[PDB]
Amino acid sequence: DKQWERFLVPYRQAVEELKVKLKGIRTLYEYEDDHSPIEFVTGRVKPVASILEKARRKSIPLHEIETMQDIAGLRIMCQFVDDIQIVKEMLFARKDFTVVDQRDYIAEHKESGYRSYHLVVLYPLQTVSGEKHVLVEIQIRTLAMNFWATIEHSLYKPEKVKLRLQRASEAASRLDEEMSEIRGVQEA
Amino acid sequence: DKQWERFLVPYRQAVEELKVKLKGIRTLYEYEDDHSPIEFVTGRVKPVASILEKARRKSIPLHEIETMQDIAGLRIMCQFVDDIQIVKEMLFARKDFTVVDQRDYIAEHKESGYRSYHLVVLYPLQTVSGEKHVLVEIQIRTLAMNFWATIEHSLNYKSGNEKVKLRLQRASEAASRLDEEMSEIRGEVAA
Amino acid sequence: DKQWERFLVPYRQAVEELKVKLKGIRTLYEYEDDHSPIEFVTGRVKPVASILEKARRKSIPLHEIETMQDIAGLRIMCQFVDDIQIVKEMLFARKDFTVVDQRDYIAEHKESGYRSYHLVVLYPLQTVSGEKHVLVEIQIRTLAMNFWATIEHSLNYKSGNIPEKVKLRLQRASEAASRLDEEMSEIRGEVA
Amino acid sequence: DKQWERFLVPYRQAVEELKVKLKGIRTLYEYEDDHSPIEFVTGRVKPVASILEKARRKSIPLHEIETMQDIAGLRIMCQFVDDIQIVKEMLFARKDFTVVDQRDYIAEHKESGYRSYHLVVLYPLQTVSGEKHVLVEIQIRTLAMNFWATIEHSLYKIPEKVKLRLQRASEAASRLDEEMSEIRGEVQEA
Numbered sequence: 091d092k093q094w095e096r097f098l099v100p101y102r103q104a105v106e107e108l109k110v111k112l113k114g115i116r117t118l119y120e121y122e123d124d125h126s127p128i129e130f131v132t133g134r135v136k137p138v139a140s141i142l143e144k145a146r147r148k149s150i151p152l153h154e155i156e157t158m159q160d161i162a163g164l165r166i167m168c169q170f171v172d173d174i175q176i177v178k179e180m181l182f183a184r185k186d187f188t189v190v191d192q193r194d195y196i197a198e199h200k201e202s203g204y205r206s207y208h209l210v211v212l213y214p215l216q217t218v219s220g221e222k223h224v225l226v227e228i229q230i231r232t233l234a235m236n237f238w239a240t241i242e243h244s245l246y247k248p249e250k251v252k253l254r255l256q257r258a259s260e261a262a263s264r265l266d267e268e269m270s271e272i273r274g275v276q277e278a
Numbered sequence: 279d280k281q282w283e284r285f286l287v288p289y290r291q292a293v294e295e296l297k298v299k300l301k302g303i304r305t306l307y308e309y310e311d312d313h314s315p316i317e318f319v320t321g322r323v324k325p326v327a328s329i330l331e332k333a334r335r336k337s338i339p340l341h342e343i344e345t346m347q348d349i350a351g352l353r354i355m356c357q358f359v360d361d362i363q364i365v366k367e368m369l370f371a372r373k374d375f376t377v378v379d380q381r382d383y384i385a386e387h388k389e390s391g392y393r394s395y396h397l398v399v400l401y402p403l404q405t406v407s408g409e410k411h412v413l414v415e416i417q418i419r420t421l422a423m424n425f426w427a428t429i430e431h432s433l434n435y436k437s438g439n440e441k442v443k444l445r446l447q448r449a450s451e452a453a454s455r456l457d458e459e460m461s462e463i464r465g466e467v468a469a
Numbered sequence: 470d471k472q473w474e475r476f477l478v479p480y481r482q483a484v485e486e487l488k489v490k491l492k493g494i495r496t497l498y499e500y501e502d503d504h505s506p507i508e509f510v511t512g513r514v515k516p517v518a519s520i521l522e523k524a525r526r527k528s529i530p531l532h533e534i535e536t537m538q539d540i541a542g543l544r545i546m547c548q549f550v551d552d553i554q555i556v557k558e559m560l561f562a563r564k565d566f567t568v569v570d571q572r573d574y575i576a577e578h579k580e581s582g583y584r585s586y587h588l589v590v591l592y593p594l595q596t597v598s599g600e601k602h603v604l605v606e607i608q609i610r611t612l613a614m615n616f617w618a619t620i621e622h623s624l625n626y627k628s629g630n631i632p633e634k635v636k637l638r639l640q641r642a643s644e645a646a647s648r649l650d651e652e653m654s655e656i657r658g659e660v661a
Numbered sequence: 662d663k664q665w666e667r668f669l670v671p672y673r674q675a676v677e678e679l680k681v682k683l684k685g686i687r688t689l690y691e692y693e694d695d696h697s698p699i700e701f702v703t704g705r706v707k708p709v710a711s712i713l714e715k716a717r718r719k720s721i722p723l724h725e726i727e728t729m730q731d732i733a734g735l736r737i738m739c740q741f742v743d744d745i746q747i748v749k750e751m752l753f754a755r756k757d758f759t760v761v762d763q764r765d766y767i768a769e770h771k772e773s774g775y776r777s778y779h780l781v782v783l784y785p786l787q788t789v790s791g792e793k794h795v796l797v798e799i800q801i802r803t804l805a806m807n808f809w810a811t812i813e814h815s816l817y818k819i820p821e822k823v824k825l826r827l828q829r830a831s832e833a834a835s836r837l838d839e840e841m842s843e844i845r846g847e848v849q850e851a
C-alpha cells in the first residue's frame with residue numbers, strides 16, 4: 091500500500107504548512123493581549139481506508155479523487171459564534187490560497203444536529219517538479235459545536251438515539267447563545 | 279528576569295516531556311482503534327507576572343514559590359467523564375513520577391461552577407547539577423467542562439467585576455447535564 | 470523591550486513557515502527513496518542583542534531596522550557542494566517568495582575563510598492587518614562547511630577580539646575543510 | 662503487516678520521549694552562560710525493511726528481534742571530541758534509564774573509517790499495560806565524524822581504491838577535529 095501513501099505526501103505537507111500559518115494567527119494577538127478569535131487549530135489527512143470508502147459512497151473514479159474536497163482538512167476552534175465570522179474575513183482576505191467552495195452548517199445545521207462552517211480552499215503547493223494545487227477543507231466551529239460533533243462522530247463505532255443526539259445538539263447550541271449573551275458584561 | 283528565566287527552564291522541560299508522554303496514550307489508541315480516553319493534551323508554564331500575582335494573594339514568600347503547585351501545568355481533555363477515570367488510573371500507575379496531591383472538583387465543583395479533576399505530580403528532572411524535582415499540576419476535564427472553563431476564565435481575566443456570575447453558575451450546570459446526556463446516549467447505543 | 474518581542478512576531482512566524490516548507494522538500498525523497506540534496510534545515514530569529522549591534526555596524530537607522538537582511542534566517546545543510554546548486558535552482562523557482570539578494574561565499578570565501586551561499590528573500594507574511602513582507606536570509610552549506618562555521622562562530626563569541634596564533638589559522642582549517650569536500654565529491658565521482 | 666505497526670509503537674514512543682529529554686540538555690546552557698556540549702540531536706526508528714535485512718544478515722532468528730539493539734536510535738552531535746566525554750558522563754549519571762552496553766568506535770574506529778561512540782540503554786516506557794523496557798542505541802559523534810559518517814553511509818549505492826580514499830577522509834576529518842580543539846585551547850589563553 092505504498093501507492094496511496096506516496097499519493098498523500100502533498101496532502102500531508104499542505105496540512106503542516108497550514109497548521110503553522112493558522113496557529114500563528116492566534117500568536118498575533120499574544121502581544122496586544124486582547125481577545126483572539128482563534129482558540130486552537132487541528133489538522134489531519136483522511137486515512138487511506140476512509141478515502142476509498144468515501145469515493146465509493148459519492149461514486150468518485152479513483153482517477154479523480156483530487157476533487158474530493160477533504161482528503162486534507164484543518165479545524166479552527168473559537169469561543170463564540172461571532173468569532174467565526176471574524177475568522178471568515180481573514181481566510182478570505184488571505185492570498186496564500188484562494189477560496190473555492192463553502193457550506194454553512196451554522197445557519198442551516200444538518201439533520202444529524204451537526205453545526206460547523208466549512209470552507210474549502212485551493213492551496214498552492216511548491217514541489218520539486220513544479221507547482222501542485224491541493225484542496226484543503228477548513229472547518230470553523232465553536233468549542234460547543236466541537237464538543238457535540240466529536241462525540242457524535244465517534245458513535246462510526248438506532249433511531250431513538252439519533253433523536254436524543256439531535257436534541258443534545260440544540261441544547262448545546264443554546265449554551266452557546268447563553269455564553270455570548272453572558273459576554274454582555276461589556277457593560278463595564 | 280535572566281534570573282527568572284533560569285528558574286523556569288526546568289518547568290518548561292517538565293511540560294514538554296509530559297506532553298509527549300501523555301500523547302503516547304492517545305497515539306496508542308489509534309492502532310487498537312476504539313475511542314481514546316484522551317482527546318487533547320496541552321501544557322503551559324505560568325507567566326512570571328501571574329506567578330508573582332498568585333504568590334501575593336496567597337502569602338507565599340518569594341523564596342518559597344517552588345511550593346506553588348501549578349507553575350508547570352498540563353491539561354488533558356476527554357469526551358466522557360468515564361474517560362477521566364481511566365486517565366486518572368493511568369497516572370496513578372505510572373513510575374516516571376509521583377502523585378502528591380489531588381483536588382476533585384468534578385465531584386464537588388467550586389463555587390464559581392468550575393469543574394475539573396486536578397492532580398499534582400512530582401516530576402523528576404535530570405540536570406547538569408544532579409537530579410531536580412518539580413511540581414506539575416495535571417488538569418483533567420471533558421470537552422464540555424473545557425468549553426465552560428475557557429470562556430469563564432477569559433471573562434474573569436478582564437479584572438473580574440454580579441448577576442452575570444449566577445448565570446455563569448447555571449451555565450456550568452447546563453454543561454454538566456449535556457455531559458450526562460451524552461453518557462446516557464453512549465451506553466444506550468451498548469444495547 | 471516589550472516593543473522588541475512584538476516587533477519580532479512576524480519574524481519568528483516567517484521562519485517557522487519556511488522551516489516547514491523546506492523540510493517538506495526533504496520529505497519528498499524519503500518516498501522517492503533516492504538521494505536528497507537537503508539533509509537538515511534550521512532557523513533562527515536574531516536576538517535583540519545581535520540586532521542592535523548589527524544596526525550600528527551596517528549603519529542602519531533604528532526606525533528602519535526592517536532594512537536589515539537577516540533578522541530572520543534559515544540554514545540548509547547539504548552533503549555535496551553540487552547539492553548546493555540543486556537547492557539554489559529549487560529556491561529560485563519557488564513562487565511563495567522572491568529572491569532579492571545573493572552572495573556566493575563558496576566561490577569567493579570570506580577573509581576568515583567562512584564559506585556558504587547566502588540568498589536573501591522577500592517573504593509574504595499574511596496577517597490580520599493585511600500583508601507584510603519580511604527579509605529572510607537563507608544560508609546554504611555543506612556539512613563540511615557547517616562543521617567549520619559552527620566552531621569558528623562559537624570561538625568568535627569570546628570577546629570578539631582574538632590572537633593571531635589562533636590566527637596562525639582557521640583559514641587553513643577552512644581550506645582543509647574545503648579540501649575534504651573536494652575529496653568527498655571526487656570519491657563519489659568514482660561510481661563504477 | 663499491521664503486526665509490525667504494532668511492534669514499533671513502543672519504539673517510536675521511546676524515541677519521541679528521549680528526543681525531548683536530550684534536546685532539553687542543550688537548553689540548560691542557553692542560560693548557563695557557557696558552551697553546550699550538545700549541538701543537536703536526531704532520532705529515528707528502523708524501518709521494517711532495514712530491520713528484516715539486518716536480522717537476516719546478523720543471522721538473528723525473527724522471534725526474538727527485540728535483542729536487536731538499534732531498532733530505536735537517537736544521535737547526539739558535538740563540536741569537539743571533549744564534549745563527547747562530557748555528554749557520555751551525563752548519560753551515565755541519568756536515572757531515567759540504565760546503560761547496558763557500549764562500543765567506543767572513537768577509540769577503536771572500524772575498518773571503514775567509522776568513528777562514533779555507541780551507547781545502548783534500556784528505557785523504561787510507562788505503557789497502559791504497565792512498564793515495558795526497550796533497547797535504544799544512542800550514537801554520539803562530533804560534527805566532523807558526522808560529516809564523514811553521513812556521506813559514507815549513503816555511498817548503500819565499492820572499488821578498493823574508493824574504500825581507501827574514504828579511510829583517509831575519515832583520518833583527515835579526525836585531524837581537522839584535533840586541530841579545532843587545539844585552536845580552541847589557544848583561545849582560552851586570552
Ligand SMILES: Nc1nc2c(ncn2C2OC(COP(=O)(O)OP(=O)(O)OP(=O)(O)O)C(OP(=O)(O)OP(=O)(O)O)C2O)c(=O)[nH]1
Binds near residue numbers: 133
Ligand atoms: N488553547 C487551547 N489549545 C488546545 C486546546 N485543545 C488542544 N489544544 C491544542 O492543540 C494543539 C494542536 O492540536 P492537536 O490536535 O492536539 O495535535 P498536536 O499533537 O499538537 O499535533 P500537531 O501539533 O497539530 O501536529 C495545540 O498546540 P500546538 O500544536 O500549537 O503546540 P503543542 O502541540 O506543543 O501544544 C494546543 O494547545 C484547548 O482546549 N485550548
Ligand SMILES: Nc1nc2c(ncn2[C@@H]2OC(COP(=O)(O)OP(=O)(O)OP(=O)(O)O)C(OP(=O)(O)OP(=O)(O)O)C2O)c(=O)[nH]1
Binds near residue numbers: 579583587617619
Ligand atoms: N561562523 C562564521 N559566520 C560568518 C562569518 N562571516 C560571516 N558569517 C555570517 O554570516 C551571517 C549572515 O549573513 P551576513 O552576516 O549578513 O553576511 P555578510 O554580509 O557577509 O556579513 P556582514 O553583513 O558583512 O557583516 C552570520 O550570522 P550572524 O552572526 O550575523 O548571526 P547569527 O550568529 O545568529 O548566525 C554570520 O555569522 C565567519 O567568518 N564565520
Ligand SMILES: Nc1nc2c(ncn2[C@@H]2OC(COP(=O)(O)OP(=O)(O)OP(=O)(O)O)C(OP(=O)(O)OP(=O)(O)O)[C@H]2O)c(=O)[nH]1
Binds near residue numbers: 324390415430
Ligand atoms: N476558568 C476557571 N478556572 C479555574 C476556576 N477555578 C480554578 N480554576 C483554575 O484552577 C487552577 C489551578 O488551581 P488549583 O491549585 O488546582 O486549585 P485552586 O486551589 O482552586 O486554585 P488556587 O490555589 O485557589 O488559586 C487554575 O489556573 P490559574 O488561574 O491559577 O492559572 P491559569 O491562568 O494558567 O489557568 C485555574 O484557572 C474557575 O472558577 N474558573
Ligand SMILES: Nc1nc2c(ncn2[C@@H]2OC(COP(=O)(O)OP(=O)(O)OP(=O)(O)O)C(OP(=O)(O)OP(=O)(O)O)[C@H]2O)c(=O)[nH]1
Binds near residue numbers: 734798810811
Ligand atoms: N556511516 C557508517 N555507519 C556505520 C558504519 N559502521 C557502523 N555504522 C553504524 O552503526 C550503526 C549502529 O551501531 P551498532 O549496530 O551498535 O554497531 P555495530 O555492531 O558495529 O554494527 P553492526 O551490529 O555490526 O551492524 C548503524 O546503523 P545501521 O546502518 O545498521 O542503520 P541506520 O544507519 O539506518 O541506523 C550504522 O550505520 C560505517 O562503517 N559507516
Ligand SMILES: Nc1nc2c(ncn2[C@@H]2OC(COP(=O)(O)OP(=O)(O)OP(=O)(O)O)[C@H](OP(=O)(O)OP(=O)(O)O)[C@H]2O)c(=O)[nH]1
Binds near residue numbers: 136144202242243
Ligand atoms: N460529527 C459529525 N461530523 C459531520 C457530520 N456531518 C458532516 N460532518 C462532517 O463533514 C465532513 C466534511 O464536510 P463536507 O464534505 O464539506 O460536508 P458534507 O458535504 O455535508 O459532507 P458529506 O459529503 O455529507 O460527507 C466530515 O469529515 P468526514 O466524516 O468525512 O471524515 P472525518 O470526520 O474523519 O474528517 C464530517 O465528519 C455530522 O452530522 N456529525
Ligand SMILES: Nc1nc2c(ncn2[C@H]2OC(COP(=O)(O)OP(=O)(O)OP(=O)(O)O)[C@@H](OP(=O)(O)OP(=O)(O)O)C2O)c(=O)[nH]1
Binds near residue numbers: 508700703
Ligand atoms: N541548534 C543547532 N541545531 C542544529 C545544528 N545543526 C543541525 N541542527 C538541527 O536542528 C534541528 C532542529 O532542532 P529542534 O530542537 O528539533 O527544533 P526544530 O527546528 O523545530 O526541529 P524539530 O521539528 O522540532 O525536530 C534539526 O532537526 P532534525 O532533522 O534533526 O529533526 P526534525 O525533523 O524533528 O526537525 C537539526 O539537524 C546546529 O549547529 N545547531
